Design a binder for this molecule. Structure first.
Ligand SMILES: [Mg+2]
Ligand SMILES: [Mg+2]
Ligand SMILES: [Mg+2]
Lengths: 143, 189, 144, 145, 64, 75, 55, 57, 68
RNA sequence: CCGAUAACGAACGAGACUCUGGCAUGCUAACUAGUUACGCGACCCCCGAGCGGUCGGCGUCCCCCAACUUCUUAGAGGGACAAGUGGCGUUCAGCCACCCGAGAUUGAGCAAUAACAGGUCUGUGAUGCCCUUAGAUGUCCGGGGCUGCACGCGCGCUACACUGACUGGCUCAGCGUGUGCCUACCCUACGCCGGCAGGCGCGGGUAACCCGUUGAACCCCAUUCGUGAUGGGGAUCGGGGAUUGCAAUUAUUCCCCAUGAACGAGGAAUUCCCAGUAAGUGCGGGUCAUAAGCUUGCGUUGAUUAAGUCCCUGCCCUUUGUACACACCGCC
């Protein structure tokens, strides 16, 4: 069976990919992962200390789903409702720096690259391993 | 055969009173896989009767502002409540819900305009549609007022409100208000 | 077993959410937006999406090949448009390529179960007026 | 492993010059120190490098003395200078995080130095009115009566 | 001394009453004794041909 | 209705009683077990998952808003 | 009168920079689509521009 | 085109010009039996025709 | 409620029935087809309202004389 | 409207009308919208699928190198009329119910005769009369004020919580705006730097070509919290950083770290509302150098109760009284 990531549950797939990136030490992280907030609209630090691997896992399948997604695209994707205190809630975008660090880390890992236009896209090896892990997690999920 | 929520066949159910028999839509044709179908049952009169009852349960459940548009939350609420009641009783959740509705339904009420100058509260009977409406309303608000300020969750309190109403245990909110209504009906009949 | 060009394309829309199903000869399989209906996002409504196929069973779905694309609206509207797109596309492909004497016994199940499976809901929205927050709700007023 | 209360537990326990609860989570329990919020507590505990799901009485005394040094002297422990309370102080120009009644001392100091220089903010502070430019025609009546 | 509860079948609806329209006069005959037809004042939307519970038989419905 | 003051963790008196009495009644939920044994509720959830990994109950629902467990089927 | 302070106040922005192209009022000015028109004036000339209350 | 303006602003500008032209022609020929005016605009030229009662005046 | 006809449609239906009776019929579609050509109705809505009233009066006149 | 009927025949307002929305696998056509099929790939596959699967990857107007409009766009049209049938009714106007039907009452605009000494001279180079007109009530510039607080009233937002909060993940909208006569002020993708608020360099868009496939909120899925004024609430207040401008103090706004106030569903009173409606929930426009707790629009999720009444509150009509006709703010 040829299993693609679109054939598997994304909640399990994201944590599978983050686990894989945890296993592979080539991926780089900034030192401020445990300190900074993930967005302007966030009220607290992420609970998970592996939130960076989670972020990379999310953006990997996002760039697979559609290409040309730049830093601003990432921040709009990961944006969220801002409680604004006493004002009515609104929408705020994610941190530009965390998207830059994750995308540049994937770029150094060399399964993503800048396109002929703006934004970035997967290398064929990228989706090769994405469908590999999707197939193995699908087998583990079904049986 | 219908398997609402993937189980709990609706063909083994029964209704003891003919008055609610034609005004309950738990039967095979009005049995749905999910309690979620906006079939426009309020467009003209007497169509909420044709609306399935389990749809009505979530309908009356979503109340009081903070959750007024959420249908999916009330659907998972009724799902968990059905699971809980079937685990702790063993009989059909829908059947025991129908029994709870029948037990909770107030057969009489008052008009409050029994005389013009002073309140008189002439006691009158209740149409079956008003019966089912009052029963479901009382049950939903009973769970609401059971689990507003406790560790106890809404699914748990909906489950035990239905259980208590089905058994007529006199501590259920709907049963108590029904008892009070019958008492005042006798008071000023 | 080798007839080509056996294809229909039937849409279904409700509340500014359209979903077009392309139906053609092939192995029994289902996909909306490139993913199977079982791997849908609001899984609490997953029984609604697998409802049409369980009505008439997989037996008549064994010889069909259908793929749906959805755009517009929200999640629930997408769900309803998808299921009505599925039912309408199957019934139209059936009536086109085989007799309607057996199409009747599959259309009647859908209509007796839910009219929306083959008739879209026309209600969309009402305009907000300049006197209150919404279409009919008005602003407050005070005499004192 | 989700076990009973160990013998070496404190249900109410003293930190600096004020007590904090024990039943609360370890990060949220220490925010009761007058000057630390949820973000500061979480970052200093993540630097403390311990179990976060354990309560305040499961903190052994070596962990107590470990966390207090970090919370008192953050700048040496790689805490960013933008994270701190008294950034660019008007006295020494040195970042610090003020805790417990030290924060009370600092706030009183700010009020009284504004009062000494007779700034508009200081005069509003003395008269108890609003200092951040908001209106006062209709609000504040709870505090005034 | 308490009369046993029984059922009444609606034959037709007479009109609205109660000084605000809140009530609805109806003509009902018991299926237990199909000869006896009495007027009763109900509370809620009632159609023709439905049935409803009656806690008493002797009591009839006056105006309002 | 004045104060709860529930136990954040077990002790001698509560742990053994939980272990001996939980797999008897039909409804095994975090809120209900908290009512019965005056435990906190984070502890109730943790104890429920530890008992599930022990095998004295079986999972039923596993929803992110409320989980259900039930006593072992006797056979 | 003196050249330096007769116009020394900058009004390159704000409500004083703009005015109605019909009556020079700076209240209720409609700047959409480059209209730059006082509202009670635009209600007067609405037909001429081509604006019609279709509904 | 960066020099050129949006079509929306184009139609707005032409309507504004028509309104100003009509008002000015009214205030100019009110005693001359002014009735109306129209414009046919082409890229080559614009032709403005004024409907009045006494064209001799 | 609210399906009563108006005098404008009613009188026109009466007049066309009385003047052109033989050409009319008991089918609504046929009635609107003849009305479309032999009468000048600017609107489709008014057209088919006229035709409906003509059909109803046809049902009346085939079994009892009317004020027409 | 029907019906009685000294009335018959009309007219205006209502209706009608225009726009709006659902239906047309019917027509007209679309490289500024696309859909299938095909050819390159890229990857999953070899247990074997192989006419296997995904791609918002590239092309088949890169013009000879495929079609068509189902989806989208907008013109011509059609389509719904109480039309059919059962019942009620004077058997008339009509009403109720049901089948077939997309639709059996979609929302709006316009709105008569008249009155309110209703509001506006502060919209106007609309305007009579009067006030001022050089120590100006003309006009310009500088500073403050329009925010100022023992208290009272109105429209709002925010919450009071476990039907929840926090973290992460999955994830779908439509209205509609976008570079300037004055007028110097646009919307913005991408890459880099900062933790954020921001800054830099390169483009695109005067617009179904770009922003944008508008990756919105809510919701949905998992973890943590645990009845504790608690991780609910974020009022008040401190320190620090950027943005706009000539200028930010009386804090313009936004961001980070700090305190965490009242508030535990609200007395008497009283507002709004019948189906995509109330509501929850965000997003556009107007305001704008900076900007929405306002307003006007849009979209999502989406109900309960009722198909009634003159009990209350108002309004109309008929009858009636009048010494009123400047019309009860009357007359006396
Ligand atoms: Mg009209
Ligand atoms: Mg603070
Ligand atoms: Mg007299």
């Amino acid at each position: 069976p040829g299993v693609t990531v679109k054939d598997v549950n994304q909640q399990e797939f994201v944590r599978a990919l983050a686990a894989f990136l945890k296993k592979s030490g080539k991926l780089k992280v900034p030192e401020w992962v445990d300190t900074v907030k993930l967005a302007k609209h966030k009220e607290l630090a992420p609970y998970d200390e592996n939130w960076f691997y989670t972020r990379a896992a999310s953006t990997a399948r996002h760039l697979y789903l559609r290409g040309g997604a730049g830093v601003g695209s990432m921040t709009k994707i990961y944006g969220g409702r801002q409680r604004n205190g006493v004002m009515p809630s609104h929408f705020s975008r994610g941190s530009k720096s965390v998207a830059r660090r994750v995308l540049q880390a994937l770029e150094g890992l060399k399964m993503v690259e800048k396109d002929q236009d703006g934004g970035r896209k997967l290398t064929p090896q990228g989706q090769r391993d994405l469908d590999r892990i999707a197939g193995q997690v699908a087998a583990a999920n079904k049986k | 055969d219908i398997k609402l929520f993937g189980k709990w066949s609706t063909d083994d159910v029964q209704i003891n009173d003919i008055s609610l028999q034609d005004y309950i839509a738990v039967k095979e044709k009005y049995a749905k896989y999910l309690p979620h179908s906006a079939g426009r049952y309020a467009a003209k009169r007497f169509r909420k009767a044709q609306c399935p009852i389990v749809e009505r349960l979530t309908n009356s459940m979503m109340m009081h502002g903070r959750n007024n548009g959420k249908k999916l939350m009330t659907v998972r609420i009724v799902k968990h409540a059905f699971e809980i009641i079937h685990l702790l009783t063993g009989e059909n959740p829908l059947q025991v819900l129908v029994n709870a509705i029948i037990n909770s339904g107030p057969r009489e009420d008052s008009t409050r305009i029994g005389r013009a100058g002073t309140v008189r509260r002439q006691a009158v009977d209740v149409s079956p549609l008003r019966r089912v409406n009052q029963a479901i309303w009382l049950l939903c608000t009973g769970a609401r007022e059971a689990a507003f300020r406790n560790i106890k969750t809404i699914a748990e309190c909906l489950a035990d409100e239905l259980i208590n109403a089905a058994k007529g245990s006199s501590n259920s909110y709907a049963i108590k208000k029904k008892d009070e209504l019958e008492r005042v009906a006798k008071s000023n009949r | 077993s080798k007839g080509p060009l056996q294809s229909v394309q039937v849409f279904g829309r409700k509340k500014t959410a359209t979903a077009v199903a392309h139906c053609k000869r092939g192995n029994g399989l289902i996909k909306v937006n490139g993913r199977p209906l079982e791997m849908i996002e609001p899984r609490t409504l997953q029984y609604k999406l697998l409802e049409p196929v369980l009505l008439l069973g997989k037996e008549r779905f064994a010889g069909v090949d259908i793929r749906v694309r959805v755009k517009g609206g929200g999640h629930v509207a997408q769900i309803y448009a998808i299921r009505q797109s599925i039912s309408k596309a199957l019934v139209a492909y059936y009536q086109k390529y085989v007799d309607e004497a057996s199409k009747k016994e599959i259309k009647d199940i859908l209509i007796q179960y839910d009219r929306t499976l083959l008739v879209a809901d026309p209600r969309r929205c009402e305009s907000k007026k300049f006197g209150g927050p919404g279409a009919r709700a008005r602003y407050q007023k005070s005499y004192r | 492993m989700s076990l009973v209360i160990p013998e070496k537990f404190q249900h109410i326990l003293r930190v600096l010059n004020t007590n904090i609860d024990g039943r609360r989570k370890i990060a949220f329990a220490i925010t009761a120190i007058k000057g630390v919020g949820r973000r500061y507590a979480h970052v200093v505990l993540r630097k403390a490098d311990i179990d976060l799901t354990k309560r305040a009485g499961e903190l052994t005394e070596d962990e107590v003395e470990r966390v207090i040094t970090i919370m008192q002297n953050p700048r040496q422990y790689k805490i960013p200078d933008w994270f701190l309370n008294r950034q660019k102080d008007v006295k020494d120009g040195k970042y610090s995080q003020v805790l417990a009644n030290g924060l009370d001392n600092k706030l009183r100091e700010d009020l009284e130095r504004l009062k000494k220089i007779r700034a508009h903010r200081g005069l509003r502070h003395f008269w108890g009115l609003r200092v951040r430019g908001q209106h006062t025609k209709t609000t504040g009546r709870r505090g005034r009566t | 001394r308490v009369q046993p509860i029984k059922l009444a079948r609606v034959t037709k609806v007479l009109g609205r009453t109660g000084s605000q329209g809140q009530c609805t006069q109806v003509r009902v005959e018991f299926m237990d004794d199909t000869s006896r037809s009495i007027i009763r004042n109900v509370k809620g939307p009632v159609r023709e041909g439905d049935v409803l519970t009656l806690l008493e038989s002797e009591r009839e419905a006056r105006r309002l | 209705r004045d104060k709860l003051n529930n136990l954040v963790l077990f002790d001698k008196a509560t742990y053994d009683k939980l272990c001996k009495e939980v797999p008897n009644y039909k409804l095994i939920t975090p809120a209900v077990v908290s009512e019965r044994l005056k435990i906190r509720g984070s502890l109730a959830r943790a104890a429920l998952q530890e008992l599930l990994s022990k095998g004295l109950i079986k999972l039923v629902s596993k929803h992110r808003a409320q989980v259900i467990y039930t006593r072992n089927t006797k056979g | 009168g003196h050249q330096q302070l007769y116009w020394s106040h900058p009004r390159k922005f704000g409500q004083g920079s703009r005015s109605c192209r019909v009556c020079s009022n700076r209240h209720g000015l409609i700047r959409k689509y480059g209209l730059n028109m006082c509202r009670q004036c635009f209600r007067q000339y609405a037909k001429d521009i081509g604006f019609i209350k279709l509904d | 085109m960066a020099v050129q303006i949006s079509k929306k602003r184009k139609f707005v500008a032409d309507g504004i010009f028509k309104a100003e032209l009509n008002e000015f022609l009214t205030r100019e020929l009110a005693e001359d039996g002014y009735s109306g005016v129209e414009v046919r605009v082409t890229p080559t030229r614009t032709e403005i025709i004024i409907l009045a009662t006494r064209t001799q005046n | 409620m609210g399906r009563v006809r108006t005098k404008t449609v009613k009188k026109a239906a009466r007049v066309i029935i009385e003047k052109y009776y033989t050409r009319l019929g008991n089918d609504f579609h046929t009635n609107k087809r003849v009305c479309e050509e032999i009468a000048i109705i600017p609107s489709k809505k008014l057209r088919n309202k006229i035709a409906g009233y003509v059909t109803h009066l046809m049902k009346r006149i085939q079994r009892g004389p009317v004020r027409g």
